[PDB]
Amino acid sequence: DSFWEVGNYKRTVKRIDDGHRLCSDLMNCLHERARIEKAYAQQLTEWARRWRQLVEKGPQYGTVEKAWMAFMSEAERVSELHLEVKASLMNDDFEKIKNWQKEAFHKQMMGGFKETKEAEDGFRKAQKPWAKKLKEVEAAKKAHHAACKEEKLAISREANSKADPSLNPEQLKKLQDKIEKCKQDVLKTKEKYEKSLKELDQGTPQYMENMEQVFEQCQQFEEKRLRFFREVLLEVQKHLDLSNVAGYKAIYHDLEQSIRAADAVEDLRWFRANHGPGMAMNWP
Amino acid sequence: DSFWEVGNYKRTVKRIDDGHRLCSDLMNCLHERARIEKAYAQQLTEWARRWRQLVEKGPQYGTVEKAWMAFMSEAERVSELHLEVKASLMNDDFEKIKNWQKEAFHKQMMGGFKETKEAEDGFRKAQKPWAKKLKEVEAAKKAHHAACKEEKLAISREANSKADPSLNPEQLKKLQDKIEKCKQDVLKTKEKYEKSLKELDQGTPQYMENMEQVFEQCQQFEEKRLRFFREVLLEVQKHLDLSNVAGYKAIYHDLEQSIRAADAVEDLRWFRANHGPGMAMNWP
Ligand SMILES: [Ca+2]
Ligand SMILES: [Ca+2]
């Protein structure tokens, strides 16, 4: 089963479809990654909505409160970033691939892709001849191998009959000339076989040349996809990369500052003035 | 409403109990955030496991199959950084608060922190000599404010008892005693409501003293907690920041590298040699 075996070009043709399917796989892949990012963002948001509420209603006041409260903002900000990845993966990468797909494969009226049919017929036309001059070069192989086994009979039937009491000038003759319609026949086919075999090696270079034709045509098509894949993945890479986004760092620089603004004393001074000895008192 | 109003110290005392609850709230807050970080990593890990298989058993081959495989790596590595966040939030932040909480609030087996009573009883204590005298002054208030109306009750019995059928002198002669004896009381009563009111001011400066003495305790306790939130929050802030890890930038360098490593031309050669014309063929 080598590429040259009549009809083994099927693998090359199979690749045109694999191409379209790989396009869909990659879309699903990026889509799944998008749903995941969105899920993380949504959770961070729920957490932020939930704890901003709980902290506000709880007995925590002052700068320590704000400090605590800054994390809800941090959570919400991270969420946004991840929704940007989701957006990028979807509106950019996903749509890009979806369009490349529709622009590279076209439906055949009957069903299937034109570029696949185009390659299928190309390989047929290019192999049609060499194959014909093989179906017979294969049939002339049986006509011979059927004699090189039919000859072992005229020699076998004359050895089994050579030892029998019911022999006659006739029965003994119906085995004599048979070793001719075989011996002189085997050579008769030994030429049929040997001929077409050389009647094939004179068209073999032509056959290879035509197959290279169609094949190169397929490599050109595959090349466009392989290259398109590299371009796309490089963009998806930059989309997922939050490790270099200055905006991401800003979130935490801001977070810290808030946490530092936390001034205990001031919070205590407040409590003394609004709930402690510092309050006004109209004595008796 | 004022803090100096007897028993209003309750608020300063309730703060103690609240301090315990805030430690717990902050714990669950970090805990939930941890759950979310783990969810994300969990999800990124399934995606990678799923797509490493789909690509391996898929028709994508060559350098491009690895540029694709490179995103599963990114997924697995981002995931680890996140299980690292959870690990910190739980093993470090949550536990740190969990120690500070328990070992700072001596919870008395029966029910109630020994730190609360310390202030509860301390307040009752400092507010006894005052709540005591106030009870005297108070009782000496509705007593005099009763003698002032006691005489004005009899004066309406003498001057308002002349239009009665034949007045009996034996009565008016002593009916004027009622209106008189009253002033003898509004003489002493007025002297008590005024004497006690001074016995009240001879303790006010001492009252406030003992009172602001306990407050300061409570303040300094609350201050322990507040400063502690500032310290533990600065630590959580760090743990959340993914930028704080070098390997983070290394993930997208390694991703980019692999992708760039994708070569169309190269990948094609391989196909031609493993499925195309390049293949070896033993001709007939
Ligand atoms: Ca304890
Ligand atoms: Ca304790």
Give residue B284 CA to ligand 1 midpoint distance, Å: 91
User: CA-nearest residue of chain B to A260?
Assistant: B230
For residue B74, the chain A residues in CB contact (below 8 A) are 240
Interatomic CA distance for residues A189 and B195, integer angstroms: 150
The region that residue A282 occupies, defined by phi over 0 for left and psi between -120 and 50 for alpha, beta otherwise, is beta
Resolution of this deposited model, Å = 2.7
Alpha carbon B30 to chain centroid distance? 14
Per-residue DSSP letter, B106: -
Both tokens assigned to A185: 């026949």
The residue written with tokens 């590595």 in the block is B77
Nearest by CB to residue A284, choosing from B197, B279, B280, is B197
B106 alpha carbon, closest ligand: 2
The residue written with tokens 């020994």 in the block is B114
Interatomic CA distance for residues A193 and B74, integer angstroms: 62
How determined? X-ray
Per-residue DSSP letter, A92: I
User: CA-nearest residue of chain A to B274?
Assistant: A3
For residue A203, the chain B residues in CB contact (below 8 A) are none
**Half-sphere exposure for A225 (CA within 13 Å, toward CB):** 27
**CA distance to A86, B151, B227, per residue, from B230 (Å):** 34, 67, 5
Both tokens assigned to B68: 């694709």
Which residues span the domain enclosing A187?
1-278
Q: How many domains does chain B have?
A: 1
Phi and psi torsions of A171, nearest 5°? -50, -35
**Best CA proximity match to B241, nearest among A259, A255, A33:** A255
The CATH code of the domain that includes B240 is 1.20.1270.60
Interatomic CA distance for residues B177 and B170, integer angstroms: 12
A8 occurs within a structural domain: yes
Q: Residue ranges of the alpha helices (H) in chain B?
A: 10-56, 63-88, 95-102, 114-126, 129-139, 144-158, 169-201, 204-240, 246-260, 264-274
B216 occurs within a structural domain: yes
Those residues whose C-beta lies under 8 Å from the C-beta of residue B271, and which sit 6 or more positions away, are: A15, A219, A222, B61, B62
Interatomic CA distance for residues B277 and A249, integer angstroms: 54
Both tokens assigned to B93: 């932040």
Q: Distance, in angstroms, between A148 CA and closest chain B CA?
A: 19
User: CA-nearest residue of chain A to B39?
Assistant: A40
Interatomic CA distance for residues A91 and B256, integer angstroms: 21
β-partners of residue B222 are: none
Phi and psi torsions of B107, nearest 5°? -85, 120
B103 alpha carbon, closest ligand: 2
Both tokens assigned to A41: 């963002």
User: CA-nearest residue of chain A to B229?
Assistant: A64
B152 occurs within a structural domain: yes
CB atoms within 10 A of CB A265: 12
β-partners of residue B113 are: B107
The residue written with tokens 């093993």 in the block is B91
B136 occurs within a structural domain: yes
* CB of A80 closer than 8 Å to CB of A35: no
Give residue B20 CA to ligand 1 midpoint distance, Å: 10
B283 occurs within a structural domain: no
Identity at B161, one-letter amino acid code? S
Interatomic CA distance for residues A89 and A239, integer angstroms: 7
A284 occurs within a structural domain: no
Interatomic CA distance for residues B255 and A30, integer angstroms: 15
Both tokens assigned to A255: 């977070």
**Helices B10-56 + A10-57 axis angle, to 10:** 180
For residue B54, the chain A residues in CB contact (below 8 A) are 25, 29
Nearest by CB to residue A60, choosing from B22, B264, B278, is B22
For residue B242, the chain A residues in CB contact (below 8 A) are 242-243, 248
Question: DSSP secondary structure string, A235-274?
Answer: HHHHHH--TT-HHHHHHHHHHHHHHHH--HHHHHHHHHHH
